[PDB]
Amino acid sequence: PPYTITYFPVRGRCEAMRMLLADQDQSWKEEVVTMETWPPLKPSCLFRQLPKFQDGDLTLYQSNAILRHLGRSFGLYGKDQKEAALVDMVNDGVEDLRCKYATLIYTNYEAGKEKYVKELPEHLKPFETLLSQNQGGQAFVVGSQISFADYNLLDLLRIHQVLNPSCLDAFPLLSAYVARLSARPKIKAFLASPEHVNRPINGNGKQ
Amino acid sequence: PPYTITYFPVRGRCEAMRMLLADQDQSWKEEVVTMETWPPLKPSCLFRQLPKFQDGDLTLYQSNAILRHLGRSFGLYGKDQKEAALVDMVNDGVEDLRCKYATLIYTNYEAGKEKYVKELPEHLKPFETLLSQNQGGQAFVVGSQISFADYNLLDLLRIHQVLNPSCLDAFPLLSAYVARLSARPKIKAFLASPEHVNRPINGNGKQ
Ligand SMILES: N[C@@H](CCC(=O)N[C@@H](CS(=O)(=O)O)C(=O)NCC(=O)O)C(=O)O
Ligand SMILES: N[C@@H](CCC(=O)N[C@@H](CS(=O)(=O)O)C(=O)NCC(=O)O)C(=O)O
């Protein structure tokens, strides 16, 4: 610690790590980058993009690398080696779908939305399946304790319910899971926050 | 162990993990899937895609989760928690470019090649820089020993020299890096093996 997140004024790729830190009782500083401060900041960013994260003397880029680091710092990475590998698997499945939603939103929202929405159940089904194989869907996506991939999947499922309000109809454990995890008191508090409610999900007005 | 890779007849998302295993003196079984056997196997794959990897009784999917699993299993994840964060970030930068190379190859090869090749220096310069900062570029991408991220970046660099043979000309540290790590005796023995040589880089004939 201390922690500082530098990012655009959107939820985007940082709302999962914000919920993690909130649920872990951490406080962090928000360095908001606007349209005017982005073109000069940009060339000093290693992969020329945001997020950027500072944790004491460590500066990190790449949102999943920031989640894996916080996962190691708070013991949110499985109870053993097999479990760590399964948490990585789920998080990459989350990242693949997060990538397709970003392409839809930012590049083909109007024409592609219905297509996207029609293929979506095949992309959500693997998570319903993991949840049924694990402790009756009553616990987390891997194991009996929360991992960084649960914050990232919770975020993904919540932005997709905005995109398509009935997308979890065929998936009961996924609907119960969104409800359960959203009611965790520090996450519930964060989701009610002005900071959370006042920023768009994405940076182009589409949602 | 034992290790079985199930995948299509290509280098694709499996050559980095094949090189890692060879360099580590491991043997593995190759289960090759074809156009005829893929449509029945596809519904049993968790995220409906290959590679699938078996390590004794652990079945994994997601190419980077498999590489992180092997990094954990073989001490190829940096010397401490800060280095592990850095290895994760490097590997995620490789995956972003790997996913753009796959879009060019599979959706836009002929029309996109020139624009892709023009933007490539900007996507390679992050790696050159990383190397500049690490023992003057004479070691690996993070620290003093190899990580799973070096296997993945080396594969990414080698398939980009096939795409555009002069791409590393402005990047002397990356150039030297490819030469150095490809000369590692077990990787060089792998790279000359018919098993490697006869496998196409991609599944559609483009390179
Ligand atoms: N792989 C990167 C992707 C980050 C990325 O795409 N960043 C975007 C912002 S956002 O889509 O995540 O909101 C960016 O900085 N874009 C500005 C630019 O490319 O100039 C990560 O996961 O951190
Ligand atoms: N995130 C997955 C991506 C795997 C993926 O794209 N798999 C392709 C094969 S390849 O492009 O990597 O060669 C596939 O299974 N395609 C068949 C299908 O989607 O039906 C990973 O990293 O492993």
Swiss-Prot record, chains A, B:
Glutathione binds at residues 7, 13, 38, 42, 49-50, 62-63. Pfam families: GST_C_3, GST_N. InterPro entries: Glutathione-S-Trfase_C-like, Glutathione-S-Trfase_C_sf, Glutathione_S-Trfase, Glutathione_S-Trfase_N, GST_C, GST_pi, GST_superfamily, Thioredoxin-like_sf. The modification Phosphotyrosine is found at residue 3. It catalyses: RX + glutathione = an S-substituted glutathione + a halide anion + H(+); prostaglandin J2 + glutathione = prostaglandin J2-S-(R)-glutathione; prostaglandin J2 + glutathione = prostaglandin J2-S-(S)-glutathione; prostaglandin A2 + glutathione = prostaglandin A2-S-(S)-glutathione. Residues 80-201 form the GST C-terminal domain. GO terms for molecular function: glutathione transferase activity. One of its GO terms (biological process) is glutathione derivative biosynthetic process. GO terms for cellular component: cytosol; mitochondrion; nucleus. The modification Phosphothreonine is found at residue 59. Residues 1-78 form the GST N-terminal domain. Keywords: Acetylation, Cytoplasm, Lipid metabolism, Mitochondrion, Nucleus, Phosphoprotein, Transferase. The modification N6-succinyllysine is found at residues 100, 113. Conjugation of reduced glutathione to a wide number of exogenous and endogenous hydrophobic electrophiles. Involved in the formation of glutathione conjugates of both prostaglandin A2 (PGA2) and prostaglandin J2 (PGJ2). Participates in the formation of novel hepoxilin regioisomers. Negatively regulates CDK5 activity via p25/p35 translocation to prevent neurodegeneration. Homodimer. Interacts with CDK5. Belongs to the GST superfamily. Pi family. This is Glutathione S-transferase P. It comes from Sus scrofa (Pig).
